[PDB]
Design a protein around this ligand. Sequence first.
Ligand code: HEM
Ligand code: HEM
Lengths: 145, 145
Amino acid sequence: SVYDAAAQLTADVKKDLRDSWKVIGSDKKGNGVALMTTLFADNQETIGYFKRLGDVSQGMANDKLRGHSIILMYALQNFIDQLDNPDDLVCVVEKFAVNHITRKISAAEFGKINGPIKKVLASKNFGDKYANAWAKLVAVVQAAL
Amino acid sequence: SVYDAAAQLTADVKKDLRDSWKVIGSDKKGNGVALMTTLFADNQETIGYFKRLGDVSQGMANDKLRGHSIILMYALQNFIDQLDNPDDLVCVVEKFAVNHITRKISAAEFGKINGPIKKVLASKNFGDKYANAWAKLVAVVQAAL
Ligand code: HEM
Ligand code: HEM
């Protein structure tokens, strides 16, 4: 359950999340768009959920994709900012989960974002330690789906 | 058409928005809930759109309303951050608008948030000049609805 999954965010996980977000979150447009095109490249079957975005291979030049990618990064910003207070983290994760549940995005489907995250981290010289901290935050959202 | 309403955000308007946001956005939970509870108090009929939140009379103590309130404030953070690049502001506002159009929230209904914003600004002693600027930012969204 999500209260139990939020409890796996221990002190070192929280610190590694903030330390990597300080670099990733510096360029929300650039890293958000890179996140999404890596998801589409590595997991082409997820493009069906994003029909409204139009031609996803245009990347940055697709205004709808660029708008979605920037907004996605503010949801991550929000989660990072709630790490101090588990009660606020949980109520924000459950609120966020509503629209993903309506779209029938399962926990297994959501978990496909981990591969893209690991790759964007790796491009900024953040290794496995950080990829695993981010997998634990994505697991809090998965528990709400 | 959003680009035309965005043209109204002149250099002084953007400056007032950024300066008031420096204070308002520094307590996203507190000021987010104050906007929402002021909206419900002043325009009781808007509660019709928020049946999922349950008992909105609990204010801050209602986890679903607190979750919604914090997420609302990250949408405004995003808008403030895109003010200097009209192309990004417009693709973010148009993406944001999609779910509100599906909820059948008209431009007039959305415009009811202006009284709440004026009151939260005035509680932090930002007068009519700042309220005016915020009405012009809300107008960019209204142009997308
Ligand atoms: C790091 C993970 C993710 C974050 C932070 C995230 C964030 C968001 C945000 C903030 C929105 C806009 C608000 C809303 O409509 O709910 C959104 C929309 C959406 N998300 Fe997620 N999401 C993530 C992963 C995923 C994944 C893995 C899928 C599906 C395979 C997914 C599918 C969708 C879809 C289909 C939309 C709507 C796109 C549109 O038509 O405009 N999301 N997501
Ligand atoms: C300053 C203005 C506003 C901002 C920045 C804002 C922001 C947001 C955000 C970020 C979401 C979550 C993503 C989504 O589902 O679309 C949302 C949801 C929603 N908004 Fe807005 N919104 C604003 C005003 C309004 C107004 C005036 C109404 C209607 C009277 C409205 C009704 C809704 C509803 C019903 C939801 C879903 C709530 C739920 O989770 O059940 N919004 N809004």
